[PDB]
Design an enzyme around this catalytic site. Structure first.
Site, PDB file in Angstrom:
ATOM      1  N   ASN A 119       0.817  -1.207   0.000  1.00  0.00           N
ATOM      2  CA  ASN A 119       0.000   0.000   0.000  1.00  0.00           C
ATOM      3  C   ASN A 119       0.861   1.273   0.000  1.00  0.00           C
ATOM      4  O   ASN A 119       0.343   2.393   0.045  1.00  0.00           O
ATOM      5  CB  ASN A 119      -0.985  -0.003   1.174  1.00  0.00           C
ATOM      6  CG  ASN A 119      -2.017   1.111   1.068  1.00  0.00           C
ATOM      7  OD1 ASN A 119      -2.008   2.054   1.862  1.00  0.00           O
ATOM      8  ND2 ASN A 119      -2.893   1.022   0.066  1.00  0.00           N
ATOM      9  N   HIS A 704     -12.439  14.095  -9.505  1.00  0.00           N
ATOM     10  CA  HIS A 704     -11.278  14.668  -8.821  1.00  0.00           C
ATOM     11  C   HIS A 704     -11.042  16.124  -9.224  1.00  0.00           C
ATOM     12  O   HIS A 704     -10.058  16.737  -8.810  1.00  0.00           O
ATOM     13  CB  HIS A 704     -10.012  13.836  -9.093  1.00  0.00           C
ATOM     14  CG  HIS A 704     -10.017  12.493  -8.432  1.00  0.00           C
ATOM     15  ND1 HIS A 704      -9.991  12.335  -7.064  1.00  0.00           N
ATOM     16  CD2 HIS A 704     -10.042  11.243  -8.954  1.00  0.00           C
ATOM     17  CE1 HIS A 704     -10.006  11.046  -6.769  1.00  0.00           C
ATOM     18  NE2 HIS A 704     -10.037  10.363  -7.899  1.00  0.00           N
TER      19      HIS A 704
END
Ligand SMILES: [Zn+2]
Length: 768
Positions: A119, A704
């Site tokens: 991650n 976004h």
């Protein structure tokens, strides 16, 4: 036998680095203050490691933002748009990571992508056609090596190697260069750096070539020979080299290993792949050292000392003790700082955990135990007792869960009927027009939503007061959706903070920490839930809100769930049983939730699996196929209990599906949403080539951006998708959730989106 740590987490005990970076970006502290905090942290962490007894301590592992980014700067591989800004080295560094505005021009960040299957996110080297390289003034590795040395710490510098550096890179805008072709231009700079490190006093260096766990194209494979011959040819003028690999096995690349014959050692990850040990031993040069990666750098469980020692003694027997190093499997940047910061964990689970501070002690303890177990017998006994306690725990021996799992059948993974039969029932039930409109899930997370959520978890407002607030938020979302004339609704998830924590809190088998943060993306960190035991669902998890939402909704209302693969992968999983066992427990828990939603007026259920692709084993073959089999089966087990008239939806946060589109198709989802608005419509060719028979909503709205796309822009995008997709399969939706947008932006954009859909409904209406 020596102990080794490949890297230490950077953020500090209380995310000190995050606090400092952000205070610097907000002008609260000076550059000098920030750099001094960096120095303070490096010194504190070197001390932790030395105090623990670690023989081989890393330097150059620390980074203010990202280590690959450090290397971009180190090799003067910075694009013009950053260097012309005439900033300080630090501000130029951050400019590449975050973006910068000097004058009227706004300079965006370099692309950041996931570091292998972790991650963690790194900045991709972004290179010109005419790219050349040179060593930066005051090179970071030398600087930090001397800093450590001056404070009494002999360290081993860590570099990302030349091959991986380019393999993980890309051509910049306006360029087409295949980065690996720039190898001959880059290698000399590594040789110069290593010479400077050697002159500074470095006896050895850790050079990471993590791409060795990949299936490599011949051009990348062929790069290792010249790169490492150059290093070997420098003889005593450079340090000894340990080549490091992690997160997978390297046994498929034994043809690459002769390139490292002039290197001192090889590091392999024996936590992820213990079975690779003995085949690797056969491939070592007569004097090469094995760095045996036996302490997990990717999870938070106390090491099984006896298991590790068996592995280590196999190596020692084959090579002799002087040719073996006890190491962390990977860098510890993927682990939290320390277990000691946790004061609210159940007392029984503490003795099963080790974070970074505990792990650096573990390598030293194991190293001592290899040759002198008597010196640490009390610590070895305590360790064995901890592992036995975990094995014997009620948490890991749930008889009801075991029994339920034993009774699962192949047939329970399948829908009652194939899509061609199902869809007729779904069509009338949902009463959908052509080009149906919907959204992905989350609605704007406003200040008051966050404030009220915090007050409830702190106990400053009652449960009844919070539930009424949540009712009102859901009513608002529904009122707005009414005014927008959307075809399928969502509730907005105002009650949810994070798509994995929300479920972890409502499942047996999980614990939560307060301080176990892990760096993810620059200075953004995550605090993953931990799976400690067998998982089950004690009560309905999301029914209350969805049930209320349906009770006031004139349109079909989406149930909203995170899939079993993601509930697993975005937590720290157990290591005592296979991940497939854990995923199945989650799948059965979620199967129950799905059935409960359907029993409460919900007949569209979205199950999202954003960790699915991330979990892919890093090379092709039997392990990758095994993963996909159980990951797919888990999703199917969770979703197959529904009636034919219920729709299963799934959202994916990518526009490309290389390798694993077959896995997406095996999910048997009725409707798929994908990110697409910023991508070329040509990426939708995969659906034609694979003859995908079910429904698809490629995002038409970039969520976004606060910009409201025009009616004509939405129309043009729908037209472009219809070049690839059949009209009857097309859904109209945004790229993703709307949590980051504001309601004015949402209303404008969704109003235009629906209007565009309505335009196409008329264009495609039957003729007279
Ligand atoms: Zn998404």
């Amino acid at each position: 036998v020596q102990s080794s740590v490949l890297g230490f987490p950077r953020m500090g005990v209380l995310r000190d680095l995050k606090k400092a970076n952000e205070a610097y970006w907000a002008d609260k502290i000076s550059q000098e203050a920030l750099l001094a905090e960096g120095k303070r942290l490096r010194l504190a962490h070197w001390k932790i490691q030395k105090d623990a007894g670690v023989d081989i301590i890393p330097s150059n592992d620390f980074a203010h933002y990202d280590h690959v980014l450090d290397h971009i700067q180190l090799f003067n591989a910075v694009p013009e748009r950053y260097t012309s800004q005439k900033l300080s080295p630090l501000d130029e560094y951050f400019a590449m990571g975050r973006g910068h505005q000097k004058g009227g021009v706004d300079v965006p960040a370099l692309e950041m992508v996931k570091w292998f299957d972790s991650n963690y996110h790194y900045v991709k080297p972004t290179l010109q056609d005419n790219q050349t390289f040179s060593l930066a003034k005051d090179p970071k590795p030398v600087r930090e090596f001397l800093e450590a040395k001056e404070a009494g710490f002999q360290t081993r510098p860590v570099l990302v190697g030349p091959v991986s550096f380019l393999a993980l890179g890309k051509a910049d805008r306006g360029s087409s260069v295949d980065p690996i072709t720039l190898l001959d231009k880059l290698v000399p700079v590594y040789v110069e750096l290593l010479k400077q490190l050697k002159a500074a006093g470095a006896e050895s260096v850790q050079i990471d070539e993590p791409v060795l766990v990949f299936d490599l194209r011949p051009e990348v494979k062929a790069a290792f020979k010249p790169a490492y011959e150059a290093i070997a040819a420098a003889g005593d003028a450079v340090p000894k080299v340990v080549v490091a690999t992690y997160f997978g096995d390297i046994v498929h690349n034994f043809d690459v290993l002769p390139a490292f014959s002039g290197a001192a050692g090889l590091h392999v990850d024996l936590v992820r792949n213990p079975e690779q040990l003995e085949p690797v031993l056969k491939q070592l040069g007569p004097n090469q050292i094995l760095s045996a990666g036996v302490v997990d750098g990717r999870n938070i469980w106390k090491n099984d000392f006896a298991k590790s020692l068996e592995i280590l003694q196999t190596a020692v027997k084959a090579l002799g003790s002087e040719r073996v190093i006890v190491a962390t499997s990977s860098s510890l940047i993927h682990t939290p700082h320390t277990l000691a910061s946790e004061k609210k964990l159940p007392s029984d689970v503490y003795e099963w955990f080790s974070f970074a501070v505990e792990k650096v002690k573990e390598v030293a303890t194991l190293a001592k135990a290899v040759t002198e177990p008597e010196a640490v017998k009390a610590e070895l006994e305590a360790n064995a007792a901890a592992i036995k306690a975990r094995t014997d725990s009620k948490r890991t021996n749930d008889p009801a869960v075991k029994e339920r799992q034993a009774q699962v059948t192949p047939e329970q993974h399948n829908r009652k009927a194939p899509f061609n039969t199902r869809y007729a029932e779904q069509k009338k039930h949902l009463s959908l027009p052509l080009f149906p409109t919907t959204t992905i899930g989350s609605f704007p997370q406003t200040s008051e939503i966050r404030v009220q959520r915090n007050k409830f978890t702190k106990g400053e407002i009652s449960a009844e007061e919070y539930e009424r607030f949540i009712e009102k938020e859901i009513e608002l979302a529904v009122k707005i959706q009414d005014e927008l004339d959307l075809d399928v609704y969502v509730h907005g998830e105002p009650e949810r903070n994070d798509m994995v924590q929300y479920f972890g809190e409502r499942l047996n088998g999980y614990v939560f920490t307060t301080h176990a943060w892990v760096q993810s993306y620059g200075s953004r960190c995550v605090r993953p839930p931990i799976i400690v035991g067998d998982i089950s669902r004690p009560a309905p998890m999301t029914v209350k809100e969805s049930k209320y939402a349906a009770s006031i909704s004139k349109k079909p209302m989406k149930g909203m769930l995170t899939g079993p693969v993601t509930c697993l992968r975005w937590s720290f999983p157990r290591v005592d049983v296979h991940q497939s066992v854990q995923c199945q427990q989650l799948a059965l828990a979620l199967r129950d939730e799905v059935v409960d939603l359907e029993k409460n007026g919900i007949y569209v259920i979205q199950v999202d699996e954003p960790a699915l692709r991330e979990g892919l084993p890093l090379r092709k073959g039997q392990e990758r196929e095994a993963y996909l089999k159980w990951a797919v089966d888990s999703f199917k087990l969770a979703t197959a209990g529904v009636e034919n008239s219920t729709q299963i939806h799934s959202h994916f946060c990518y526009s490309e599906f290389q390798d694993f589109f077959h896995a997406i198709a095996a999910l048997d989802a009725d409707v798929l949403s994908i990110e697409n608005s910023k991508s070329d419509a040509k990426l939708l060719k995969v659906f034609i080539d694979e003859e995908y028979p079910r429904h698809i909503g490629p995002g038409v709205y970039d969520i976004h951006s606060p910009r409201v796309p025009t009616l004509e822009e939405f129309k043009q995008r729908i037209e472009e998708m219809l070049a690839y997709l059949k009209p009857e399969q097309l859904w109209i939706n945004p790229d993703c959730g709307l949590k980051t947008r504001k309601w004015d932006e949402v209303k404008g954009a969704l109003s235009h989106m629906v209007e565009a859909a309505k335009y196409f409904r008329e264009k495609y209406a039957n003729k007279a």
